[PDB]
Design a protein around this ligand. Structure first.
Ligand SMILES: Cc1cccc(Cl)c1CN1CCc2cc(-c3cnc(C)c([C@H](OC(C)(C)C)C(=O)O)c3N3CCC(C)(C)CC3)ccc2C1
Ligand SMILES: Cc1cccc(Cl)c1CN1CCc2cc(-c3cnc(C)c([C@H](OC(C)(C)C)C(=O)O)c3N3CCC(C)(C)CC3)ccc2C1
Lengths: 140, 140
């Protein structure tokens, strides 16, 4: 459980928001990209795996599953690539927060990182950031 | 100790590598940018604070300390901004790893994220990624 992540892709303002969700905690990382490609997904995953112990990634669709560039990044980073309700509720919630901060941010990416911050800090009493750290520390 | 980070800036291939070091563990996050500006530093810090519990940032120079954009990001993210050997050895080590992977990466940013990964996973027996998680979990 501690090493399992789910990728998730959603659209906003003509751009794409790529999200990784740590399944057991609900903790997220996200980035704005112009469109989802294999190279963007591969790079996102390389970043994620250098920061957290990513063992398994449930890819968000069959194109990223099939992408040899994504496969190369999973190979490089030691990630097991696998296939994929709660995430749909996650996308609506992320878009909700983005709308609440949109007035504070000129750039979409700034608003998206504000929403990542608010999501990971929200208490509902532990936060997702506390849960992911607690879950991984007990694995150690 | 668990919430203290040090910013660090170094040059390579005509670009800038901006590094945040979790002081107590040696864990790092890094990004390639064209040049260090207040807006790039502010954005980097917003990202960092949504992912880890950043309480205090020792800024890397007086321009980022003074930057009202950096101050605004620290205010937004609840970071105490403060002022600033080991980091110089960190920069040399990061450049060392980047050179070892440079042949595997077309883009500098890819090589930089490979070096972030290798740095955080290296055992020297715990890794920096294990230490930062252990340090923060005990604070909880
Ligand atoms: C709030 C504060 C605290 C302490 C001192 C001072 Cl004196 C201030 C007032 N500041 C004085 C500079 C300043 C710059 C900004 C600012 C300017 N341009 C842009 C592009 C952004 C931002 O993109 C970035 C993230 C910089 C790429 C965006 O996408 O909107 C900015 N940030 C808004 C979001 C933020 C995370 C809060 C950081 C600041 C906003 C507000 C303020 C107001
Ligand atoms: C290694 C492997 C495992 C499983 C299946 C397959 Cl069949 C393969 C072979 N792959 C078959 C596709 C492919 C694409 C690449 C690839 C292509 N273009 C670029 C720009 C990059 C990379 O930028 C990115 C990170 C994609 C923006 C860069 O900066 O160099 C690439 N990555 C090199 C680094 C990586 C983290 C390893 C991920 C792949 C490299 C190697 C391979 C070799």
């Amino acid at each position: 459980s501690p090493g399992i992540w789910q990728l998730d892709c959603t659209h906003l303002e003509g751009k794409v928001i790529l999200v990784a969700v740590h399944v057991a905690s609900g903790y997220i990382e996200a980035e704005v990209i112009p469109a989802e490609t294999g190279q963007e997904t591969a790079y996102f995953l390389l970043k994620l795996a250098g920061r957290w112990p990513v063992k398994t990634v449930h890819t968000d669709n069959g194109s990223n599953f099939t992408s040899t560039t994504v496969k190369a990044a999973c190979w490089w980073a030691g990630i097991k690539q696998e296939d994929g309700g709660v995430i749909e509720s996650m996308n609506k919630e992320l878009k909700k927060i983005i709308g609440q901060v949109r007035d504070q941010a000129e750039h979409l990416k700034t608003a998206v990182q504000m929403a990542v911050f608010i999501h990971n800090h929200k208490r509902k009493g532990y936060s997702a950031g506390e849960r992911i750290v607690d879950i991984i520390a007990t694995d150690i």
